[PDB]
Design a protein around this nucleic acid. Structure first.
Ligand SMILES: O=c1ccn([C@H]2C[C@H](O)[C@@H](COP(=O)(O)NP(=O)(O)OP(=O)(O)O)O2)c(=O)[nH]1
Ligand SMILES: [Mg+2]
Ligand SMILES: [Mg+2]
Ligand code: NA
Ligand code: NA
Length: 326
DNA sequence: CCGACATCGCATCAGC
DNA sequence: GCTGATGCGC
DNA sequence: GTCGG
């Protein structure tokens, strides 16, 4: 919030290039800049001062100068006036409506909340659930509620089988006082990178949480990734808690540290760290860190015993979860 | 310059 | 049905 | 849009 005007402006630009332009790389660029400016511990006085930060190049620096002089950015004033953009940006806020569907619905003449509720038959299952909880999914989750939600998940998980390990990652593991959703990383000794000795390891846990009415809706579901909806139980006479997004990732137990690294994030932190891994000649995913022969093709999984081992391989100081909120 | 830009699971559709 | 391209998740 | 060779 110290350069909060500049980082917002850049976040708006990022969303424009993503939802309207469909320029994924311009989107990531704006977001990197906004991230490296958010952590910058001084109040930016000029575009040139900002340009010294990596990821802030010439075009962004002039946009900062313009914002500092006037309080605004004309390119954004224009983008806001355009009706196709405004519609597209709005539709992309429904979970499951991306840039393509959004542009597609606009061509169909579907461009308001009202248009979507009246053409529910024109949405896929995810989009239908994303529309139903539209308001709820715009709210943040207070850490106190994350804590309540954590008890239930962990204790319900323990009820299905004491050998599961469930770990709330995401922004919650980085200490955030609020979160957009709850991310849960799941391990069980039966599912390793070697073998799967038990099927439906994820289904059972989803099933338990549906049973106790914690999980209310399913966005998508496969053998290792669940994306759905949950809700904390309310007390008597008390207004209900908003419905919350929940993601659940089942990961081979021997690959826990790579998995907990990835799912802890932030997304921009993983991108910076994975790009540094590439520059150091490594490739990191949620399963393994592997070397790169000049071939291009990744070699074999390196041995990992902690999050820090991954950091060491690319020659970075270890950074605590709270210090990864980029 | 100009090629790269992080990485992948699940849903959906088209081609066969 | 199987395969492969594409969208979408943020 | 930025960055590295
Ligand atoms: O494009 C992405 C998105 C997420 N991720 C990762 C990191 C991340 O923090 C984790 C969970 O994703 P979320 O969408 O839940 N973002 P996060 O939990 O960090 O913040 P919040 O959910 O409160 O907006 O998975 C990526 O690696 N790439
Ligand atoms: Mg999250
Ligand atoms: Mg999530
Ligand atoms: Na720079
Ligand atoms: Na969306």
């Amino acid at each position: 919030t110290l350069n909060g005007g500049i980082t917002d402006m850049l976040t708006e630009l990022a969303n424009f290039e993503k939802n309207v332009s469909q320029a994924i790389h311009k989107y990531n660029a704006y977001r990197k800049a906004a991230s490296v400016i958010a952590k910058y511990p001084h109040k930016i006085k000029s575009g040139a001062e900002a340009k010294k930060l990596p990821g802030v190049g010439t075009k962004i620096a002039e946009k900062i100068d313009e914002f500092l002089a006037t309080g605004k950015l004309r390119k954004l004033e224009k983008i806001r006036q355009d009706d196709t953009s405004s519609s597209i940006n709005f539709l992309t806020r429904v979970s499951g409506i991306g840039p393509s569907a959004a542009r597609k619905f606009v061509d169909e003449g579907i461009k308001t909340l009202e248009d979507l509720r009246k053409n529910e038959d024109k949405l896929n299952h995810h989009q239908r659930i994303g529309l139903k909880y539209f308001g709820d999914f715009e709210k943040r989750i207070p850490r106190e509620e994350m804590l309540q939600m954590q008890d239930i998940v962990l204790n319900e998980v323990k009820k299905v089988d004491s050998e599961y390990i469930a770990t709330v990652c995401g922004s919650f593991r980085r200490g955030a006082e609020s979160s957009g959703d709850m991310d849960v990383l799941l391990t069980h000794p039966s599912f390793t990178s070697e073998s799967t000795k038990q099927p439906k390891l994820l289904h059972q846990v989803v099933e338990q949480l549906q049973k106790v009415h914690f999980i209310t809706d399913t966005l998508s579901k496969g053998e290792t990734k669940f994306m759905g909806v949950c809700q904390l139980p309310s007390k008597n006479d008390e207004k209900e808690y908003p419905h919350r997004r929940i993601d659940i990732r089942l990961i081979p137990k021997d690959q826990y540290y790579c998995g907990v690294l990835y799912f802890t994030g932030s997304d921009i932190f993983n991108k910076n760290m994975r790009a540094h891994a590439l520059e150091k000649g490594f490739t990191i995913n949620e399963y393994t860190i592997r070397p790169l022969g000049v071939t291009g093709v990744a070699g074999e999984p390196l041995p990992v015993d902690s999050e820090k081992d991954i950091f060491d391989y690319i020659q970075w100081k270890y950074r605590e979860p709270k210090d990864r909120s980029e």
